[model samples]
Target chain A: GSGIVQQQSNLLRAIEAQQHLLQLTVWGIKQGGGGSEWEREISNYTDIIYRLIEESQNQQEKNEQELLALDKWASLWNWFDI
Target chain B: GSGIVQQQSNLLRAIEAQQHLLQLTVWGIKQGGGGSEWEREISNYTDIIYRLIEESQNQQEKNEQELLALDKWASLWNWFDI
Candidate 1:
């Protein structure tokens, strides 16, 4: 349970988890509905930022799997201490 | 020059031009970016930039050599007789 791999794994799960939660704020900002100009600008940016957060979360999730897989493979093949 | 070599050269120059501009967008989106995450993001898009500069500088050097004129120097040195 205690090694560098698990520590890093535990760390990134928290980060990716936060990003999934962070988009709710972006979504909330997107909903200041009115027939307006800055409102359009606000939505424009919020939409993009939500895209950013989601992609970030996805990348971290992908990285997590890769990191763990490499860790295990390295250990199984005696590439390094897993 | 209009055959396979020049055609592939033109195509790659255009594609790598886009890659050059792509850095500015990433550079802004991820301000104060560095380390494992940010470094890798910047990396994938820029792997060709050095080669672009290398080829481009060689092109410039060739142009520079052609641009130098013996006429200007010859005329200036002719005034030495005056």
Candidate 2:
């Protein structure tokens, strides 16, 4: 762990994972791989991220995960979270 | 019209709005309305954001959006924005 991550970031990322998972799920249902590849990638990242956010023991690792999550999560919320 | 979007959040959300708008536009172009509702909602949110960001001069509204924006921006940076 490089440093301690804030709990808020952890919670925020977890929420994002939930949102993106839904987006990808819907994309999978409707498009069948149109931009599904991108959604898949996003899903993979967020899933891996959510897992890390929830489970990371290292502060650095968690912080890093949170940092990345911030961008993706921000994007998701800015557009969809209202 | 509403409040100040952070110059950072403003710039950030503008970027976000752009990204979501593009996604929505693409969804309209390629996948059609199947999931277009969600994407439209996303687009509407972002467009309103971009416009508010550009046009608004209020503090409270900007603060609120920034607070919300901060949450999202924070997540995207969580893991890797380091």
Q: Model 1, stretches more than 4 Å misplaced?
A: A1-35, A79-82, B1-82
Q: Candidate 1 residues B1-82, lDDT tens each?
A: 1222332363356345444435543453455333455445444434454454455445444433433454467668999979
- What is the TM-score of candidate 2? 0.29
Q: Please tell me which predicted candidate would have the highest DockQ against the true structure.
A: 2
lDDT per residue (tens digit) for residues A1-82 in model 2: 1122133334334434544554554455456454757766776877676686656445556567878988898898888955
- Two-chain DockQ for each candidate model: 0.01, 0.07
- Per-candidate iRMS values, in order, are 20.4, 11.4
Fnat values, candidates in order: 0.00, 0.03
Off by over 4 Å in 2: A1-5, A33-43, A56-82, B1-82
Interface RMSD of 1: 20.4
Q: Tell me the tens digit of each residue's lDDT in model 1 across A1-71.
A: 11222233333333333333333322333343225654565566566656655665666677678789989
- DockQ, cand. 1: 0.01
